[PDB]
Write an enzyme that holds these catalytic residues in place. Structure first.
Site, short mmCIF file in Angstrom:
data_model
loop_
_atom_site.label_atom_id
_atom_site.label_comp_id
_atom_site.label_asym_id
_atom_site.label_seq_id
_atom_site.Cartn_x
_atom_site.Cartn_y
_atom_site.Cartn_z
N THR A 102 -2.45 3.88 1.91
CA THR A 102 -2.57 3.70 3.35
C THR A 102 -3.39 5.01 3.77
O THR A 102 -3.98 4.75 4.75
CB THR A 102 -1.15 4.03 3.71
N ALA A 161 0.86 -1.22 -0.03
CA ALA A 161 -0.04 0.15 -0.17
C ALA A 161 0.76 1.24 -0.02
O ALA A 161 1.73 1.38 0.94
CB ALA A 161 -0.77 -0.04 1.29
N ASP A 162 0.53 2.18 -0.94
CA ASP A 162 1.38 3.36 -1.21
C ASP A 162 0.72 4.56 -0.47
O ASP A 162 -0.25 4.31 0.46
CB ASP A 162 1.68 3.64 -2.83
N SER A 163 1.08 5.70 -0.57
CA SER A 163 0.56 6.88 -0.03
C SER A 163 -0.84 6.79 0.01
O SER A 163 -1.64 6.73 1.27
CB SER A 163 1.29 8.07 -0.68
#
Ligand SMILES: *P(=O)(O)OCC(C)(C)[C@@H](O)C(=O)NCCC(=O)NCCS
Lengths: 50, 50, 135, 72, 134
Positions: D38, D33-35
């Site tokens: 997340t 999960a990226d920015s």
DNA sequence: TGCCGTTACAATGTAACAGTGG
DNA sequence: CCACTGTTACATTGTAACGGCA
């Protein structure tokens, strides 16, 4: 044989292209509005906290 | 006076709740769709960035 | 115009409406003769997969009675379809007992606002009491 | 329960397998999960338990174990 | 048992419901083979104007999974039919915007009351507040 | 338990009112 | 004016979930 194979090829081509056209458009739409709604929500959250 | 202000605060809270729930539902649906397209139709065929 | 009009969707809606009305037994056709009415209905049935021709079938055999109901139903269906995207634009259907609804409608007609607005004002007064109690 | 509602939320907000999401599974490196992913995960965690979290204390959460620790 | 059940009425209700479901595509019968299902549906279609035999038809060919749905549909139909006689027993249906409904349902669940009871209490409190001010 | 009343919805269809632009 | 659209307030039918009671 030529007629049958040409009909099959045309049907495959048309079905595939039209299905992709039908689906990907709405998929990209939903993605764009999701991004926009997230951007909108962050500012509300920030103001609310203070 | 403080109560009067907290009324606007609660209004903003309701707005933020609405937006957050919308975004969360959209993300959940997008994730479910991605997991339903494990059939490899998504890498380029569905994701037409054009 | 606030809602985008889509031809290939409204045409399908119209075709489904006509078929539903017919199977309910109503005389969608403008023909009093049985044979012509049956032929027109059969042609409409053939038109299932061609919603575009449904507008023409309407202009040729649709009963003159149904223009108002047609234009009402498809308009409402369009509004609901576009509102269903987001929860905050959806509508919720509830049922009220006659005394309760009578009092509520009298109050709303007194205040000159819609039922949802009257409920908003009422729940807001209750929540103001709750807020003041909380502070 | 909370300790499995957390997995329900993480898996259905990141799309990763239930088996993948262990207590120590970090979101960015393990779950990927990226920015924004997340951000949406924390928003969903907030929604599930109808609570709110501070910005800094929320961003401090970067793992399943930390997620539950702040939730429970 | 509060509402008396009338056979020639409830049986017509059941026949209409089954015909509606069949016209809607629902599989009325328990026969997977299309021939037997069509034969049973034709028997039902020609069975119009008969309570004592539509009941038997239901007992013999009815789809097992639709029994509960049909029973509760007939329950609701009976209750509405008996309540629609008097104005005070009728029910008024309205549409509420989602936020308003959400708040109202929150209150109703919180207090354990129904929507009608919750709104009645709230209106009474509003009137009481008016009298307090006035 | 299985029937029976009861509630809270969902889906669709209509009448009536208010707006908008040609 | 006139037509077409948006909206509210219903009705109508169907369904699932509770809770009472034999
Ligand atoms: P990702 O690399 O796209 O990063 C997203 C984000 C962390 C920048 C974003 O979710 C975010 O937190 N934006 C707001 C940052 C902030 O603290 N602003 C103050 C309140 S508006």
């Amino acid at each position: 044989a030529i007629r049958v194979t040409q009909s099959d090829r045309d049907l495959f081509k048309h079905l595939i292209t039209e299905a992709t056209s039908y689906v990907s458009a709405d998929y990209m739409r939903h993605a764009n509005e999701r991004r926009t709604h997230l951007d909108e929500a962050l500012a509300l959250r920030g103001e609310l906290f203070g | 006076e403080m109560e009067n202000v907290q009324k606007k605060l609660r209004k903003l809270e309701r707005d933020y709740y609405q937006i957050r729930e919308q975004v969360v539902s959209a993300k959940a649906g997008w994730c479910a769709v991605m997991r339903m397209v494990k059939d490899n139709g998504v890498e380029r065929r569905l994701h037409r960035r054009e | 115009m606030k809602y985008q009009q889509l031809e290939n969707l409204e045409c399908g809606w119209k075709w489904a409406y006509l078929i539903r009305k017919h199977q309910e037994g109503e005389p969608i056709t403008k023909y009093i003769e049985n044979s012509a009415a049956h032929a027109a209905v059969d042609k409409l049935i053939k038109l299932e997969s061609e919603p575009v021709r449904v507008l023409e079938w309407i202009e040729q055999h649709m009963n003159p009675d149904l223009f108002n109901r047609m234009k009402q139903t498809i308009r409402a269906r369009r509004k609901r379809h576009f509102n269903a995207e987001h929860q905050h634009t959806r509508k919720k259907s509830i049922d009220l007992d006659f005394p309760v609804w009578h009092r509520l409608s009298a109050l709303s007609q007194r205040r000159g606002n819609t039922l949802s607005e009257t409920i908003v004002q009422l729940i807001e007064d209750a929540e103001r009491k709750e807020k003041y109690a909380n502070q | 329960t909370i300790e499995e509602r957390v997995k329900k939320i993480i898996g259905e907000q990141l799309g990763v397998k239930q088996e993948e999401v262990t207590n120590n599974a970090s979101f960015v490196e393990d779950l990927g999960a990226d920015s924004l992913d997340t951000v949406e995960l924390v928003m969903a965690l907030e929604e599930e338990f109808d609570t709110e979290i501070p910005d800094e204390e929320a961003e401090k959460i970067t793992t399943v174990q930390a997620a539950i620790d702040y939730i429970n």
